[PDB]
Amino acid sequence: DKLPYKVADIGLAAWGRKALDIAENEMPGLMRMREMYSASKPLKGARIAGCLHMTVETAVLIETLVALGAEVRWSSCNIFSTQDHAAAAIAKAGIPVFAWKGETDEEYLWCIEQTLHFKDGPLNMILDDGGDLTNLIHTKYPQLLSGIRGISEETTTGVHNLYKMMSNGILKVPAINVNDSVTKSKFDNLYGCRESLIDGIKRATDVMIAGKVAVVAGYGDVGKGCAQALRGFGARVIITEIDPINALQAAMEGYEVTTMDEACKEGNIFVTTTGCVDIILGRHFEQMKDDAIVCNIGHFDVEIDVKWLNENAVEKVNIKPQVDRYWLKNGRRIILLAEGRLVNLGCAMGHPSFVMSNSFTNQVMAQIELWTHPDKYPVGVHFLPKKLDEAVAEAHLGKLNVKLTKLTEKQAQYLGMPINGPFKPDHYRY
Amino acid sequence: KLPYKVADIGLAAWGRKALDIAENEMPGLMRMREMYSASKPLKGARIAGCLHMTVETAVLIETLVALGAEVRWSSCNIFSTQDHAAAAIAKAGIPVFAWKGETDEEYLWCIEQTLHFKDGPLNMILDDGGDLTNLIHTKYPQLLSGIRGISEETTTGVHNLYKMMSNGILKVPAINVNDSVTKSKFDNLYGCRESLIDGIKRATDVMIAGKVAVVAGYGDVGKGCAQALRGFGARVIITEIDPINALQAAMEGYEVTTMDEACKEGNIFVTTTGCVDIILGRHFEQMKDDAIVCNIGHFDVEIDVKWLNENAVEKVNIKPQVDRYWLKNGRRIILLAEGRLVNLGCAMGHPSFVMSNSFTNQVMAQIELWTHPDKYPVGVHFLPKKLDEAVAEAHLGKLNVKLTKLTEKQAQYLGMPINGPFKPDHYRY
Amino acid sequence: DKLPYKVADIGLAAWGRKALDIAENEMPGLMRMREMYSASKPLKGARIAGCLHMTVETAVLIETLVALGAEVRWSSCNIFSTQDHAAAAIAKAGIPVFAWKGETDEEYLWCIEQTLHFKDGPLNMILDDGGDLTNLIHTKYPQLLSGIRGISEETTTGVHNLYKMMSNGILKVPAINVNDSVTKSKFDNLYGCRESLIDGIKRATDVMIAGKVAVVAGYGDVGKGCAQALRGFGARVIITEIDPINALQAAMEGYEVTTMDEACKEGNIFVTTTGCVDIILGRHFEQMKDDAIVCNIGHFDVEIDVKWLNENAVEKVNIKPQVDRYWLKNGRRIILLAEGRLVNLGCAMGHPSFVMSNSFTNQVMAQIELWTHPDKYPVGVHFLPKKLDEAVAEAHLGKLNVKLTKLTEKQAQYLGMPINGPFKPDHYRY
Amino acid sequence: KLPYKVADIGLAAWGRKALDIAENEMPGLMRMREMYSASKPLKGARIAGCLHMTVETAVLIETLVALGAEVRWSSCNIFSTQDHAAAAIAKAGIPVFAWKGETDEEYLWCIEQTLHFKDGPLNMILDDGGDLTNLIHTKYPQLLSGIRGISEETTTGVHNLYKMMSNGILKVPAINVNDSVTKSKFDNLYGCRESLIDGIKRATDVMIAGKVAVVAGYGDVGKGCAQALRGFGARVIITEIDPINALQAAMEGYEVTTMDEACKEGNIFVTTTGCVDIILGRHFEQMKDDAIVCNIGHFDVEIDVKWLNENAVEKVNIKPQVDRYWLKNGRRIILLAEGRLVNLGCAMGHPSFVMSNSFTNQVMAQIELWTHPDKYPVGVHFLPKKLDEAVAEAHLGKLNVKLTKLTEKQAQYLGMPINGPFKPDHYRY
Numbered sequence A, C: 001d002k003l004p005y006k007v008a009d010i011g012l013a014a015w016g017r018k019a020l021d022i023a024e025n026e027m028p029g030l031m032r033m034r035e036m037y038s039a040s041k042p043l044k045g046a047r048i049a050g051c052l053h054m055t056v057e058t059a060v061l062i063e064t065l066v067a068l069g070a071e072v073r074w075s076s077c078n079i080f081s082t083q084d085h086a087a088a089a090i091a092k093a094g095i096p097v098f099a100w101k102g103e104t105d106e107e108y109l110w111c112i113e114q115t116l117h118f119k120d121g122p123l124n125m126i127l128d129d130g131g132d133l134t135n136l137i138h139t140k141y142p143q144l145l146s147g148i149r150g151i152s153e154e155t156t157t158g159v160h161n162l163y164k165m166m167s168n169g170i171l172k173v174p175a176i177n178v179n180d181s182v183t184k185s186k187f188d189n190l191y192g193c194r195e196s197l198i199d200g201i202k203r204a205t206d207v208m209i210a211g212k213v214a215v216v217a218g219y220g221d222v223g224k225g226c227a228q229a230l231r232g233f234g235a236r237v238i239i240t241e242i243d244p245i246n247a248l249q250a251a252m253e254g255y256e257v258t259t260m261d262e263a264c265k266e267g268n269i270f271v272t273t274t275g276c277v278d279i280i281l282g283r284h285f286e287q288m289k290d291d292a293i294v295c296n297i298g299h300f301d302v303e304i305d306v307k308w309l310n311e312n313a314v315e316k317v318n319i320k321p322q323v324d325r326y327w328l329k330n331g332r333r334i335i336l337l338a339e340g341r342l343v344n345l346g347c348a349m350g351h352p353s354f355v356m357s358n359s360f361t362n363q364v365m366a367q368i369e370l371w372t373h374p375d376k377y378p379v380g381v382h383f384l385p386k387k388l389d390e391a392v393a394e395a396h397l398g399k400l401n402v403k404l405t406k407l408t409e410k411q412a413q414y415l416g417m418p419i420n421g422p423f424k425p426d427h428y429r430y
Numbered sequence B, D: 001k002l003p004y005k006v007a008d009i010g011l012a013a014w015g016r017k018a019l020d021i022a023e024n025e026m027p028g029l030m031r032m033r034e035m036y037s038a039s040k041p042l043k044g045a046r047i048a049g050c051l052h053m054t055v056e057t058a059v060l061i062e063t064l065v066a067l068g069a070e071v072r073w074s075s076c077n078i079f080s081t082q083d084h085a086a087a088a089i090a091k092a093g094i095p096v097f098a099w100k101g102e103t104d105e106e107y108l109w110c111i112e113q114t115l116h117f118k119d120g121p122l123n124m125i126l127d128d129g130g131d132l133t134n135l136i137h138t139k140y141p142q143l144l145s146g147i148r149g150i151s152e153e154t155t156t157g158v159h160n161l162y163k164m165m166s167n168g169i170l171k172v173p174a175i176n177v178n179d180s181v182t183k184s185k186f187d188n189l190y191g192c193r194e195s196l197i198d199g200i201k202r203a204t205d206v207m208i209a210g211k212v213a214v215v216a217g218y219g220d221v222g223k224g225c226a227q228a229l230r231g232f233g234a235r236v237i238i239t240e241i242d243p244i245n246a247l248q249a250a251m252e253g254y255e256v257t258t259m260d261e262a263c264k265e266g267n268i269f270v271t272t273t274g275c276v277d278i279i280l281g282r283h284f285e286q287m288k289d290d291a292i293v294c295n296i297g298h299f300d301v302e303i304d305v306k307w308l309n310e311n312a313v314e315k316v317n318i319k320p321q322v323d324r325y326w327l328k329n330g331r332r333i334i335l336l337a338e339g340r341l342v343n344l345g346c347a348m349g350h351p352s353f354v355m356s357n358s359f360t361n362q363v364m365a366q367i368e369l370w371t372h373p374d375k376y377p378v379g380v381h382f383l384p385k386k387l388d389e390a391v392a393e394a395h396l397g398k399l400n401v402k403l404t405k406l407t408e409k410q411a412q413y414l415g416m417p418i419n420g421p422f423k424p425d426h427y428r429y
Ligand SMILES: NC(=O)c1ccc[n+]([C@@H]2O[C@H](COP(=O)([O-])OP(=O)(O)OC[C@H]3O[C@@H](n4cnc5c(N)ncnc54)[C@H](O)[C@@H]3O)[C@@H](O)[C@H]2O)c1
Pocket: A155, A156, A157, A158, A188, A189, A192, A193, A217, A218, A219, A220, A221, A222, A223, A240, A241, A242, A243, A246, A273, A274, A275, A276, A279, A297, A298, A299, A300, A342, A343, A344, A345, A350, A351, C405, C407, C411, C423
């Protein structure tokens, strides 16, 4: 009585499959998980509802979970991030996916709702990115919580929410924080954004980066990646920050660190990375250089006051999908990307597949941990063990032709560690 | 006569919006309009243009028109046209014969459409790579005495001009635009530094970080390519024939070796040489699985694409301008744009700001040749340094640069005109 | 009956004082500690034995501890690292310092021994860098342990030893791990080495960096700094690593990662950063390019087999102090810096003062924590609270003209944090 | 006659060990020895050299001697001599008159000691900045007809040569060594990229990261300086008079503004212009406390040091070549080397490898002028590109670079001699 899937055009499946084949060959961590666990099927019995950007890389993740024995139903965690060819390939393979590029808010919620019920029963695992699925179940379907064995969560904003839920006694299911695996936060958030931020800006606007002033709000792992990208192409990068440690890191790297109240007068490009509300406001827009480009890469579209532009501009000219040029009362123009939604996935294709193999190999490990060892994980928010984190990295070395040194027994004795690791104390920051 | 031929005139409104955006990024061209729209220095000029029909080129076209020229236009590559830009130019009433994905026959037909105007044949050439110049000299020599001048955009095209002059076969005066400082040291360098990666990413979405990337040639193009790749975390290996360029690359921290060795290590290959026979069958056979191979030189002569078509066991089209070959050895090769320049073939070419440097030089060269032909005997000439400096100066305001002015005491100390030119003729910047 | 101090030449004091005045003005964190606590004198009653490189920066630290009420007696923790003008200035101010550049191993131990006994009694606090003082007291003077209120420890090797001591039940005094303050490990070890490694190499050898292959063993915080420095000047940098996560970081930054067994055939410059034994051995030396430069920046001189060179070379030619050129049986030459001791302090002046103000402001905070709040700190190894770590960074922002953004009450509510911080969870890696 | 005059002959053994090390880093010079020591092309040459008396220059001196020249030497700066290198040269029996920390009178006396050899006056000039050239022309014109040639090392010196020729006052042929590609694009750029920081660090030990650094000029020197500072985490602000250089700096991500503005923000100031009156009293009065101020241009004319001496309320010598001034406003200024070039005055100048490029050009220019005077009429000349390429090629082996060779088919395609030169005369690299 329900749709078996819902995608833009199932006819795109053959093209999606070609993109998947190429991506598989860039994702050795995921392929290794298939190779190790396809026969034993550790995820047999798992009914995973996933809510995560329905991209080519997410399709390789989905097929890994399926190869490992899971039943899966999927939606995207952003209205603009789905790659319709990837979604079509997943649907063609018989996997229930409810996702397309350019959903409305209503369609978005409907899609998540389709993932909750399997033939054998409701979901018993959650794989989430940003917390929308986690929150939906806790608030709207609390009756389903005792049936769920575990949650794994992809991103900084989502894990922040899990910590908040736990400290408020609202969290009712064990969760693993995948964002804060070393091999996720220090790779995907950093090197991922270093490539895909500029990709979104370029595909949207074709603007020259060299010669511009770029303003990056936040200097966490995402802001660090974005700043490096922009400066690499010859932009002069200004940073805003609230945290004196991150601010001091930026200044030590040669960036001017000042407030948005000042930087708004100088920036030609504005990128928000904070995960926080009220970063770019009407008072900033009114002071910006003509044709300033403004975009957000944080998870939710809460950083930029897009409502201000819609209410106060003389006119809004749509240039092409996800690219709007507003004409203000001061006669100047602002170019706004993706209506303030995360620009790398909304205007380009998100992070390339190789780095997503780090993040998603963590996801598969988390799902195996929660599903097969539920009693290691009481209701709470947990990290994967360092030995598994190290294993994720080690799985990607051969593709890059890296040769890792092995400690001799004498060196391992001297350092007081096992020759097979883990090699760092739990507080190590890399 | 056909007013134009383009893929889809319906793309005109979008094209125009992209032109509006690009105008605001092209202060040199907008300045040429503000200075010369009234006096119309190019009145009576009938310019045939053969140059990648992009948004940037559209802004150049409408600048030439504003300055009084009649213009008829074709692209200098079968894959580089941006159909929305060609539609905007067609809708404006300018004869343009260009679309993305031309056949070789269509390519020549389009150039041929640019030769004849209502009032006579062309009397000015604006060229990129020399196809229009060569076509006239070889096939339409009866039009040569009617042509006042040629201006040439690119390294490969200027090499051809110098060779023609040395052999006594050039018959029309030319200005080498490529070797204006504000072209060669900006467009070829900073332009490729952004548009090479754009082409590779739009085509393949591949991660750059952690890869080995092999860049053949370390000229102005290869310098920009190499910096771009290294910036994203590729380990870049350079090949070179010139010991000076090779020493530059080594002093910037790049491994310099031959393609014969580098083919065994690269995950990404980019040819920047302007030379034939750079990546051959013997190289393809040694490459890592799913090696991405592409060219950014003007002509598609650097990569043996014919070898792949003849020797691969499978050839799968992934999407337009992206082919995945399976070789007898079991490994795969990803070839971009059939070896044609990848930035314009798989993306949008250089962004507008830097093209404003190149194209302001083009406008100046067209004015120089059209209005001061006697300064330019048959031969190959540079624009004066004062004009080259003026191109850079016109772009400083947009970037909020504050230029220092010499005092009279400092100008006297330096033995320099206070208003420039500031460097000797041999200065390399 | 004992020397009041022992330095190379007390006559250098006036020049030392001029260097100190300049350094003070680059060390706003330490000067702020003086300004805040000079009147209340929180360290009144403290008798601090310090064992830490007797440099210009350490002199500003010492005078801060004294201004805060402490009695101090000092030695260097390396035989080659003392700056004789700094030592002379300290001695001239009436502070017992036992340190000079170029001590023998015997003199080194004698110097530490002079710091143990004060007029009023034995030491009751330890400030250490590498653990030599901590170990000396636990092994040779166990009778003094119950009189010691606390230990603060500067460096990675020293903190590793403290963790080992604690897990073996050998640690008898509470300790604070200053190395792993964010504002120490992610600044001093990284940005400090990024400047002072090249300084030591240049002053020793004047070698051109551009065009060379440089091999860096280890890609921790020190190796990251060293690699960046070398590549910035046009060296091609190869990295060795045992930890697959650090190895993957290096490869993602564009370095070749391979083993020393391979890299030894290619390197023109070799820098060891591991903190581990047996990094460069005779088998590597015999394969090195002619005039390969070999140096160590790790704390102890255990990385390079200098004994191999001394036993196997045809001859050793001293070029100048801390620079030796060995002629091997293969006819090639090796240039060895500082006899394998840490090259930044041995051949140049160590880290510049601004970054040392981060490290040493942590040291002063640790000493205040341990001395005035002993019951917060049971026998064990502890970190400073994140709020104090943030304060260290904030203290350095004004000197760099950084403008830090303040959260609004609405943003702080949204992020669920205090407007005054701390701004990050305890696991945050920066 | 005095055999030499140096600070301390006792430093000879150490000097020699430093020379031994530098020889192994200078394959171009060692190659000139291996090729020409037997044939002695410079037999009969009596070369007066005026050039920073460093370890690198010692290797140049002994190369000229190996090639048959007689040489007598002085430094071109009062603070740049390396006394151990001067001692090694003196101990070898070569007349050198140089020490670190000369007075102005001693400086001139030393140059005067180089004019007369046992067999006659000088017949060749090797100059850096033009002091020897100018001294001969103005004070010893009777020696001019006896001088076969001049070779000149540096930008400021070549500017003077061109000005002299334009005014008809140059009377001896000269080779512009600075503008060999392998000099200007290597020494001025990569040399300063390492030796500027060396000078600042040895003098002050200041942290670079987190500072604002102001670099006046973005020529080859300022480009290398700016990269060096940015690499260590300084935020670099550029000043410029030339709109081309200024646009380059902006396209590399540097703020470009005037010294009038930048003096309010910089923590470190470096002058690279070759021009008078760059940092004035009005700038000093606005600077941040403990601003470090230094010059790397040839002559000490860029910084108003006299202003500081006259207007400061206190002047404290921190150590040799380092002065801390206290101004009326309460703030301090740290001045390096009394405004003299800071890399050679406070450190060791450029490392040996890159100097091997510069100095191989010098040897070639001395051979060209001495053995082929008829190729060089009175005027200012470049070395042929084939010789410039040969300089780079001689340094490739040391760095294990593998240079590709064109095939006959590629050379024919490019219209290029298979063995070079590979670039046209106007190529800018
Ligand atoms: N689009 C993507 O592919 C992608 C990838 C990874 C993470 N993310 C998202 O990016 C966002 C940031 O992630 P992160 O890992 O960098 O988190 P982070 O905590 O490491 O960094 C955020 C930084 O913003 C700063 N900040 C907070 N409020 C600010 C304000 N008002 N002004 C200036 N700075 C302020 C904080 O001090 C912090 O350092 C999150 O929403 C995360 O979920 C997106």
